[PDB]
Design a binder for these strands. Sequence first.
RNA 1: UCUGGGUCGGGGUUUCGUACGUAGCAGAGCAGCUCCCUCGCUGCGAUCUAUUGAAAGUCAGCCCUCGACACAAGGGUUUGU
RNA 2: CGUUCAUAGCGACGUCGCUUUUUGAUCCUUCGAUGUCGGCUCUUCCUAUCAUUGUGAAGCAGAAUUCACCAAGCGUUGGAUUGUUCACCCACUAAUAGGGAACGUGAGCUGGGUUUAGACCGUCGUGAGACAGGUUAGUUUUACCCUACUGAUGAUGUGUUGUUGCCAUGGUAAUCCUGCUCAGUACGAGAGGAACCGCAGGUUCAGACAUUUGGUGUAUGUGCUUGGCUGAGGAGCCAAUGGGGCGAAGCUACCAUCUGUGGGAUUAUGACUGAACGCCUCUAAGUCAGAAUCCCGCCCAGGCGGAACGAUACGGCAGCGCCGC
RNA 3: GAAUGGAUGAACGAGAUUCCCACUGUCCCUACCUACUAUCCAGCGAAACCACAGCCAAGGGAACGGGCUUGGCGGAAUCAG
RNA 4: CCUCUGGCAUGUUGGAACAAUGUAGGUAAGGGAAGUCGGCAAGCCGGAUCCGUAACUUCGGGAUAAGGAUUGGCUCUAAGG
RNA 5: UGGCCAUGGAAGUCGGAAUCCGCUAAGGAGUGUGUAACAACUCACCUGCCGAAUCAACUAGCCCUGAAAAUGGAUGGCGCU
RNA 6: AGGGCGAAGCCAGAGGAAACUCUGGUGGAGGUCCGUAGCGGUCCUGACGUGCAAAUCGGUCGUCCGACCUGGGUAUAGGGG
Lengths: 131, 394, 63
Amino acid sequence: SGAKFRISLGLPVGAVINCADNTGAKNLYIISVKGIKGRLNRLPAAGVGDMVMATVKKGKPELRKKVHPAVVIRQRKSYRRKDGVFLYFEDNAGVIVNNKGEMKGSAITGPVAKECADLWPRIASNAGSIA
Amino acid sequence: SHRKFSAPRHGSLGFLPRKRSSRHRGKVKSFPKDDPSKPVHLTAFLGYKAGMTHIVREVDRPGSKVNKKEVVEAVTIVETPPMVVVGIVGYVETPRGLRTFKTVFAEHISDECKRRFYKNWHKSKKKAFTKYCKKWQDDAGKRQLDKDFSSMKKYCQVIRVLAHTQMRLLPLRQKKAHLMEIQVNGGTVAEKLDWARERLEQQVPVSQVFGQDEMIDVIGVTKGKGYKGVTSRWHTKKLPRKTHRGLRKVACIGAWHPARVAFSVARAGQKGYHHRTEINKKIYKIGQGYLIKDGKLIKNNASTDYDLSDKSINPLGGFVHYGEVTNDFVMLKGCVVGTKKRVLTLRKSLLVQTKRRALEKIDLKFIDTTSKFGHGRFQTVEEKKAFMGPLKKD
Amino acid sequence: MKVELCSFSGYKIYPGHGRRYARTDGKVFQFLNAKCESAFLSKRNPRQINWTVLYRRKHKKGQ
RNA sequence: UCUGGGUCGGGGUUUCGUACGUAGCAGAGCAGCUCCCUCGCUGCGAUCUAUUGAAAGUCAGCCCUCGACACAAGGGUUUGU
RNA sequence: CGUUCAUAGCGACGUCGCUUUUUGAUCCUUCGAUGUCGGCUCUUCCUAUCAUUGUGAAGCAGAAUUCACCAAGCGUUGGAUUGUUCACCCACUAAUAGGGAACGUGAGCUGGGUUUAGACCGUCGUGAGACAGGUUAGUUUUACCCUACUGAUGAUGUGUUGUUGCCAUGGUAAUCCUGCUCAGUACGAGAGGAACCGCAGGUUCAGACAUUUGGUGUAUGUGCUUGGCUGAGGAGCCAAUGGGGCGAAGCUACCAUCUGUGGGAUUAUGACUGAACGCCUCUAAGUCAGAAUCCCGCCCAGGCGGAACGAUACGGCAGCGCCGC
RNA sequence: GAAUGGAUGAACGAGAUUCCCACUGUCCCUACCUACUAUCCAGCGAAACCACAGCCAAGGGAACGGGCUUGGCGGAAUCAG
RNA sequence: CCUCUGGCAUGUUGGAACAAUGUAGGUAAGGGAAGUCGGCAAGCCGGAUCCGUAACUUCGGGAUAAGGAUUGGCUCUAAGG
RNA sequence: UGGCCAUGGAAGUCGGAAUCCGCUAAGGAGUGUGUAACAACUCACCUGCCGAAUCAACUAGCCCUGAAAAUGGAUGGCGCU
RNA sequence: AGGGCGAAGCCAGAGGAAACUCUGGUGGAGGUCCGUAGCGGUCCUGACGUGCAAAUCGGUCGUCCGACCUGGGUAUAGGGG
Ligand SMILES: [Mg+2]
Ligand SMILES: [Mg+2]
Ligand SMILES: [Mg+2]
Ligand SMILES: [Mg+2]
Ligand SMILES: [Mg+2]
Ligand SMILES: [Mg+2]
Ligand SMILES: [Mg+2]
Ligand SMILES: [Mg+2]
Ligand SMILES: [Mg+2]
Ligand SMILES: [Mg+2]
Ligand SMILES: [Mg+2]
Ligand SMILES: [Mg+2]
Ligand SMILES: [Mg+2]
Ligand SMILES: [Mg+2]
Ligand SMILES: [Mg+2]
Ligand SMILES: [Mg+2]
Ligand SMILES: [Mg+2]
Ligand SMILES: [Mg+2]
Ligand SMILES: [Mg+2]
Ligand SMILES: [Mg+2]
Ligand SMILES: [Mg+2]
Ligand SMILES: [Mg+2]
Ligand SMILES: [Mg+2]
Ligand SMILES: [Mg+2]
Ligand SMILES: [Mg+2]
Ligand SMILES: [Mg+2]
Ligand SMILES: [Mg+2]
Ligand SMILES: [Mg+2]
Ligand SMILES: [Mg+2]
Ligand SMILES: [Mg+2]
Ligand SMILES: [Mg+2]
Ligand SMILES: [Mg+2]
Ligand SMILES: [Mg+2]
Ligand SMILES: [Mg+2]
Ligand SMILES: [Mg+2]
């Protein structure tokens, strides 16, 4: 119901955020950000809570050499919450996911940002810590 | 050939000759339409941008994720000491336009105001409206005055009051008080005029014009930035590193064959000190100034029902590059045009406001009052004196 | 508006100001300003640093 | 002459992070002298504690002073229905 | 052909056209030189409309759709390979439409490619040498003139001066999307599966701003530290800003925050009354609804265009304003 | 395609490519700072270039006009770009 | 890089400002070559001591391969004539 | 009158050779709709009302559709019914 | 300049029945490596481009005991060197 609000989005296309679920992937080469019309010369950028296409660069060879959807869960670029607290996360991080928002993994190492948790429920269910 | 990859053009043509504004005091380019029905009122005011700060508030837009969640919010303090009406000035409709018809000035006029009428006051003998004010004490003059007012009753349509600021009461350097025509919007012109004739020489405070949680339009001149290149002034792409004759430029001004450079092409020139009328700036707080019943009432500014301390909106060490706001002020949401100290015209909206957001009632929870002259960490001096304890300066 | 305390210095942090850090261990820190946060990230033991609360508690200052 | 604006000073604010000096039974050890006492005394000795959120800067485009000091109708060129 | 049915969509055999974003013809212009491809950057136009608004069509149940109309307001992206144009692939998207401006744009760049001289290879040549055959290395000049544009002083007028104002004319701006709700509802055998009004937000664009987060930082602010140098201490300096922490103010970032509006005429279209044509017809006279259009509004600038009001040279020589003659 | 040398090849190369790690304002996307300029002033003081000149639309015209035709129009003297 | 001896007056001028463009330096959040014909440019790396060192090889090399750790100040000890 | 060819079904009706008589006031061995095929529907001859012209096929005048380009624009301009 | 690598020869010790082999030193080879002066002149396609300059400047670079650099003297002269 209640919609997202924009947040300072510090993952341009070209990032390798570390996969923080138990798949067997280690990295997630963001090749594109979902739901970006975009402008000339401008890199598509995914903050936290953003869907994303993601090649795996290192990990299991099942996953390597193909594209998966993914979600950004933490991010090192400090966004501002509506309550006027800026927040950043120590590492950029995501999870491999399917089109309809379900995880293909099962358990999320590390904390998930609540911008991502509220917007992705199945991620939120497998997230131990939030914010 | 066509440009390969499309892109929307940089900057708006709806804003140009991007030149240094003639005026300093921002003109009200249109007052609202006076319905004749609702009672008489002033449509505009003239404040001063003293400074910014936080607020905190519970928000009540149901549906949002932020419903019943305390957000913070930036705000401008516009110090607005009461204006003095010193004139009225009748207008009449014509097919040519809207001719000024008759200006009746008050009797007594301050040196605050009289300042304005001379380019050099030190050197003048201060002889303005001297033979004028003779009119206000005889049979002949008073009669002519009445006939002028009667004529305005017969003929005029639009009536604007002339008021001016109380430059006296500010922390600014200048004494030369800003005048301004403000339009009286209300009932019939005869009623309209006798209201302004009653208000003559009198104070008018801010609360008489505006009310709380009201969208108003801020009108002013932008913070000026001098000569600026095209990359600053139009936000054109920089060219790359290797460019031989510089790179904060536009490469192709224009095509060959309209063999002129067009008005739509980006060139370097004056950036800033433009006239600009930002609209829909909601008044969160109309704040009561310092006053005396026995001791000072400094509290009445930045105290909220939920805070209850003894603050004023003045932060520690004052608003920077300004002063103390010792007078009544408004507190708009967000930034507004111009610099610190800049004279600023407020104006009631041109527009029938009926959006959820524009009828929202603002209850403030907390005004930040920490210094802006560095990273502040104490809200008030008494709090600081508590936290630190005693210092070597004792 | 729950005023928080700076995880380095000890000062209160009013709603507006400062920054919130969320380490992957899964614990969070609040910093009044960058000055605190830099000393935190460079691993400065705030009890060694005079101007913090933790130092002054340690050295019995005031009282 | 709303006596004013200005310089200096004083507060406030704020930046940095605790000055010099002095004292110490703090100080890894070392030495000189002896009362060869090794807590003897005296010296060297990074650093430490205390004095000390100290010192220092803070409009030059921060805020208030009404404290000290002078200085404030002065000059030149104009223009007429 | 389309089960059936020439024309929903198509369309053979024939035929009539437009177009100059293809390539040819041609050689009128330029050989006392008009800088020869592509990309970047920027502006503007066209429509032969991909999307978006409003609509007619279907072989349109819904969803998806192709066909057509008004229509160019607003958009039309990120990459891999290639010097490329072109091409192709991945990804996102509402859509990844097509062009023009000396095949826009070298005193705007770049110079990868063509296209000197150095060299290699292949084929051809007795050979010098040749090759829209491949390769590698190879100088990208000048603006202070005039205009145009950008901003900047001014100009004639109004007796002089100041004021607060009006407004001729120019410009002009907003965009599209998601989610929730309607609703697993209409529609449909089911599978699937809408829409209007609301509500919450976001894209791109525009205009600001610095409370906050970030950036800068020679306040050369305050520590810390290298080498040297004032006999040492203290206090300092030098090393083209010695180096580095932290850093006020100030600039400043979708890297922070705020704001972005209302009418009128109508177009396509669908209608009314209604003849022409004893009926019927949206039309012939007459009338209605009607839009990302257009015109204005708001918004920016403000005319060899005006306005009301103020004060109008005590003087040491002054000089003027009215009035009447 | 075999001393018009063929195939090879460690070491070496301001030689020609391709990828990876690191690293970065190359870029997303631009921003702030410093010095010397440019700027204004005193003094000093060149050059190239120059038919006349210098606002446009369209027309025709040696088939892309500043000048011609028909329209739009036109306001001293200048400054930085 | 800083200093004494000796030598100079900043390289054919001065002053006031601190705009745009530049020339020469720097710094940048998150990402890290997505830029571009092409990592061009800049950045990383750098000294020393101690470990540790691959493929390949003409057995000489490769080799500072790579990859690691340490480094200051102070007060002592031991070892070298 | 399931007329005949065609069976895959065409008793008027995908198509084609046929193609007349009766009743007749008069209805084609059938214009279509549609059917597996019928059915059902629909398309002359005649009336009832109303009250003088009505209707077809060609043809040529003006006008209109056909009729899409990129700086803003040209019956020469203003304009003109 | 200053460093690096450490070739032959030489010493000792250990093994070997012999052949000889290992280990530690010493030794200081080389159109050897780094790198100054020197000589050069890669890239920035940087600066400059009516220049400082009719080819210069800055950083970045190649080489730096050898087919090394370099003064003076001397030889070769135009279809000739
Ligand atoms: Mg691009
Ligand atoms: Mg296009
Ligand atoms: Mg270049
Ligand atoms: Mg501040
Ligand atoms: Mg057929
Ligand atoms: Mg041709
Ligand atoms: Mg030319
Ligand atoms: Mg069309
Ligand atoms: Mg061209
Ligand atoms: Mg050109
Ligand atoms: Mg060129
Ligand atoms: Mg080339
Ligand atoms: Mg060649
Ligand atoms: Mg000049
Ligand atoms: Mg000292
Ligand atoms: Mg030097
Ligand atoms: Mg119609
Ligand atoms: Mg209508
Ligand atoms: Mg309408
Ligand atoms: Mg207009
Ligand atoms: Mg051969
Ligand atoms: Mg042979
Ligand atoms: Mg051969
Ligand atoms: Mg000419
Ligand atoms: Mg100098
Ligand atoms: Mg000099
Ligand atoms: Mg000289
Ligand atoms: Mg960066
Ligand atoms: Mg690219
Ligand atoms: Mg690339
Ligand atoms: Mg390089
Ligand atoms: Mg190697
Ligand atoms: Mg060059
Ligand atoms: Mg030049
Ligand atoms: Mg010189």
